[PDB]
Amino acid sequence: FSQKVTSITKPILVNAIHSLFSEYFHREKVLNVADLGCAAGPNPFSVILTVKESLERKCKELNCQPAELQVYLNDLPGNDFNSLFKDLSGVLRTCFVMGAPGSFYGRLFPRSCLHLVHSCYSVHWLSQVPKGLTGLPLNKGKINISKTSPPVVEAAYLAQFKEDFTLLLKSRAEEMVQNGRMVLILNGRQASDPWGKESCYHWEVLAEAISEMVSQGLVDEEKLDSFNVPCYAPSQEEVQDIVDKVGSFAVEHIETFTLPFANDQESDTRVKGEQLAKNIRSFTESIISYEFGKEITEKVYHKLTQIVVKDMASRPPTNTTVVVVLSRTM
Amino acid sequence: CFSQKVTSITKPILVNAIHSLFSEYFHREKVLNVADLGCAAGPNPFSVILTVKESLERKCKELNCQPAELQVYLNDLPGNDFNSLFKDLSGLRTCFVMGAPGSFYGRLFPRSCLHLVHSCYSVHWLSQVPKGLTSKEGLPLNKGKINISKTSPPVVEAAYLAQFKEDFTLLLKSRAEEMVQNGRMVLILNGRQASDPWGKESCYHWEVLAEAISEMVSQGLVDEEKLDSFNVPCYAPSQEEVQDIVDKVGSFAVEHIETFTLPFANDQESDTRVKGEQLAKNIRSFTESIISYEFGKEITEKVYHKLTQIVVKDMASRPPTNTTVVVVLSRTM
Ligand SMILES: Nc1ncnc2c1ncn2[C@@H]1O[C@H](CSCC[C@H](N)C(=O)O)[C@@H](O)[C@H]1O
Ligand SMILES: Nc1ncnc2c1ncn2[C@@H]1O[C@H](CSCC[C@H](N)C(=O)O)[C@@H](O)[C@H]1O
Ligand SMILES: Cn1c(=O)c2c(ncn2C)n(C)c1=O
Ligand SMILES: Cn1c(=O)c2c(ncn2C)n(C)c1=O
């Protein structure tokens, strides 16, 4: 899945880079790139290579020396920059890679210096759990928007997102050169899709595993009730509406695509389920662990592995991605 | 006290260099860019950030202008503990702090963007152990020691100086390409008074480590050939050497040159034992990794135990000094 996403989207990144060339940004002394929420895995390496290779390839054609490249790798201060920097030791030459700790909800970089901003699977995370999920907890059974969720949950999540995403765009707007491009890829939904397993498979199946622990009386039902993940899956329409209100970007590309969550290149339904569960753990573990402690979380994932395995044998789940490319105007 | 003494004595030099930036109206540019070479993870980088931030804010008040934004690059080798550094920096408004992993012997930053470069106790470390500390035959010159000593043949001295000339030149050439016209660079490093002999006067730590090693050779727990052909990639230059190297690189003017010598141990401690133990701990903390890599964990732990006994003994008779060289450059042409 992670592989599928990066490979499907690579041409979009490359097209955005090509836009930079018809502005002669490759003729400037340095090209500045930012990756928002880079984590520590291989995706940042691949973003660096894509830009580096495309920049080198084009300067070969035009018989000029390539601009130098500066890549800022942004993530929250708790990110494992140590590992990231150790792995980057095995691009160089004319290539200067920085760590930029901080939240992308706010200023991170000098005014109008960025030529390219990139983000893959970060900007769906909210700055806080949305307000108005309370006293008394609305959204009783669940940890995200669901089939069973009252209309107010939906509206609260959307409102939080509108705030956050607007603050993201405003910050990036201040930091980008005229005609700079920004490529944003995030977990999303098809508008005509219902809530529940269609769009938020992972949040639904986690709430199931929690509910099994409540049922075993190992967790208070009030805890599940007033637990909510600070994460939203927008439609492309929502994204585009938010962008429309911030008058400093032109939309150059908008896209939604839906894949199977489970890995195709595996024939056995077992393993397929276990892998998907492992995958889900790997990006939900820290938020779950922090809320329920190590002992209970270990139990939650064991039941999760049983739920997904069962799901593989009947209706296999999907996952949906929204992609937008913006150009800085005015 | 020592690390504290160095940062506090040199703070005015940093501030003067910053003030030079103001008379170039760099505070009127959109961003002021600062680099700290070899920042490690301790409190010194925080203090450099504060010094610049405070001075920049203070002077924009005075001249009634819009404050430039501040960008600070914190450079160190990859596998420096940037995790801890970044966590501590969280306890930062129009103030953008970056990690810049890599060696300062080489390019690290875009061409001509830096206004201020700062470095405290880094650039004395060489890029490699210097070549030519072994004869044609294959015999190791510099028999007893791990740095330049009283007992060292002339070729050791000349090889270390040559390595430093290479390294320091490469540092200056790289920074020259990366600094704006009239940018300042403040370099503070462990050094020597020219008229000082080699040995305990200038390289206390290398001398006392070679002692501890020699005690392990004496207990036959380490081959004498290992000590013989082991050499630390570190030099303590005179201010004259530094100035000669700078003179050959035609892109900097010297604005300040300084040598000063302090007691190594913390003076505000009355007990000789603790004074010695502290100095030893201090010495371990900056020599551990290169000692450990060479002799393994088991014998290194023994080396530091004997080191702690040697320094404690030294505190009670002749207390050691340590010497610092400081230079400030301006980017010209
Ligand atoms: N406000 C914020 N500012 C910066 N990083 C953030 C953030 N909120 C979440 N993140 C980071 O976003 C990342 C999401 S995981 C995706 C990582 C990478 N883009 C990839 O494709 O693999 C995490 O590392 C998380 O710490
Ligand atoms: N070539 C090189 N490039 C970058 N950092 C280097 C380096 N050689 C040594 N260093 C770093 O220089 C540091 C010296 S310790 C000094 C820490 C800090 N400047 C202070 O005043 O406390 C070490 O962390 C070491 O890893
Ligand atoms: C890192 N990450 C997420 O953060 C994520 C996700 N699906 C939804 N989200 C929120 N996937 C597949 C993922 O790899
Ligand atoms: C890192 N470091 C050194 O590298 C050093 C030193 N004194 C001498 N040297 C070489 N001190 C105090 C120090 O902290």
Residue numbers in the entry:
A (entry chain B): 26 to 115, 124 to 167, 171 to 366
B (entry chain A): 25 to 115, 125 to 366
Question: Would you copy out the relevant sentences from the publication that reported this structure?
Answer:
Our phylogenetic analysis showed that although the YM genome does not appear to encode XMT-type caffeine-producing enzymes like Coffea and Citrus, it does contain three recently and tandemly duplicated genes that encode CS-type enzymes, IpCS1, IpCS2, and IpCS3. A second enzyme, IpCS2, shows activity only with 3X to produce TB, while a third enzyme, IpCS3, exhibits a preference to methylate TB to form CF. Thus, collectively, these three enzymes appear capable of catalysing a complete pathway from xanthine to caffeine.
In order to gain insight into the structural basis for the convergent enzyme activities, we obtained a crystal structure for the terminal enzyme in the pathway that forms caffeine. Indeed, our computational modelling of theobromine in the active site of IpCS3 predicts it to be oriented as we have discerned from the diffraction data. In CcDXMT, the NE2 of His160 and NE1 of Trp161 form hydrogen bonds to carbonyl O2 of TB when positioned for N1 methylation; yet, in the structure of IpCS3 these corresponding side chain groups form hydrogen bonds to O6 of TB. Despite these two residues being conserved for H-bonding, the substrates are rotated 180° along an axis going through N1 and C4. Thus, the conserved His and Trp residues interact with opposing carbonyls in TB/CF but still position the substrate for N1 methylation. Tyr368 of CcDXMT is found to participate in π–π interactions with the ring structure of TB Lanzarotti et al., 2020; yet in IpCS3, Asn353 is found in the homologous position and the amine forms a hydrogen bond with N9 due to its proximity within 3.2 Å, which is additionally stabilized by Asn221 and His236. Because the residues in these positions of IpCS3 and CcDXMT differ yet contribute to TB binding, these independent replacements represent convergent structural solutions for N1 methylation of the substrate.
